[PDB]
């Protein structure tokens, strides 16, 4: 709310479209002032001065120039229209993938991990407000690919093995939340001979103290 209220250039992308179209029309109208080799740019001046044979020569010059001017305008509008259509197709895609769903595509729905988006309408355009999750306040930990226990190699089911310097834990990857390493949050594959960088630590079994 505050940024838009204090930034004159915020909607430059939409203003540029307005400006380009205005410029093209102003140019087209201004071409009516050109003589194109005729005695006058004004058709009424020609008709009030000359009889039909001599007049047809002067008029033909204006027709040639004015037709060329109009063709130039239309060609430019067709090219510009294609560019706008591509933008509209992208906007429609974002509406579907950012607003009507949560997107995994990187940088498609804003910077960071996409949570959700909200559309706002604008003059000849659309504004998307993208809500993202951005990780913060990272800290360094020691890590290992696997834990060796009872002669078996254990891997995290969902998270990553970390150490605070003295104790080993398993945590979810995008948010530090250390938990005791157990048979509930790890899985076993083979022995401890294969994995490079495997470390020795206890793996806890919750039924142990019960049975």
């Amino acid at each position: 709310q505050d940024s838009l209220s204090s930034t004159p250039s915020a909607l430059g992308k939409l203003q540029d479209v307005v400006n380009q179209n205005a410029q093209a029309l102003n140019t087209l109208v201004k071409q009516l002032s050109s003589n194109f080799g005729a005695i006058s740019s004004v058709l009424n001046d020609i008709l009030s001065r000359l009889d039909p044979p001599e007049a047809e020569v002067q008029i033909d010059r204006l027709i040639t120039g004015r037709l060329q001017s109009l063709q130039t305008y239309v060609t430019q509008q067709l090219i510009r229209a294609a560019e706008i259509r591509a933008s509209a197709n992208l906007a429609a895609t974002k509406m579907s993938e950012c607003v009507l769903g949560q997107s995994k595509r990187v940088d498609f729905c804003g910077k960071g991990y996409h949570l959700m988006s909200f559309p706002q309408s604008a003059p000849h355009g659309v504004v998307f407000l993208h809500v993202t999750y951005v990780p913060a306040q990272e800290k360094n930990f020691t890590t290992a690919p696997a834990i060796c226990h009872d002669g078996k190699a254990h891997f995290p089911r969902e998270g990553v093995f970390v150490s605070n310097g003295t104790h080993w834990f398993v945590t979810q990857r995008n948010f530090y939340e250390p938990q005791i390493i157990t048979t509930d949050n790890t899985f076993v594959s083979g022995n401890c001979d294969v994995v490079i960088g495997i470390v020795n630590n206890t793996v806890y079994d919750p039924l142990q103290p019960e049975l």
Partner: protein, 114 residues
């Protein structure tokens, strides 16, 4: 010798000072003088400091108003060494919810010329 003349300016809302680029020529043939790949730049102070690009000149050279107009090689961003090792991992302990805007054109004015 021939070529384009371009005028480098901060907005007239900010200043009336300008610098002039004489495209594709040596500064010797022109009549704060700095030769660039884009041509001869006159009226801008060339510095060895590097900044984000403000007004692009070409071939890495940009100009800005800092008072006088200065010319410099643009920076691509701050240098950052990631503390990589074979047993070190960095994990976020917090997060921030971010909201950003994206603006797209959808339609034009529907003109019609008879």
């Amino acid at each position: 010798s021939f070529g384009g003349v371009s005028v480098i300016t901060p907005g007239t809302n900010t200043s009336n000072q300008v610098a002039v680029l004489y495209q594709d020529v040596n500064c010797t043939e022109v009549p704060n003088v700095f030769q660039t790949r884009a041509g001869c730049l006159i009226g801008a102070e060339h510095v060895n400091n590097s900044y984000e690009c403000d007004i692009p000149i070409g071939a890495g050279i940009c100009a800005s108003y800092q008072q006088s107009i200065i010319a410099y090689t643009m920076s691509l961003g701050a240098e950052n060494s990631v503390a990589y090792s074979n047993n070190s991992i960095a994990i976020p302990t917090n997060f921030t919810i971010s909201v950003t805007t994206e603006i797209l054109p959808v339609s034009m004015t529907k003109t019609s010329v008879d």
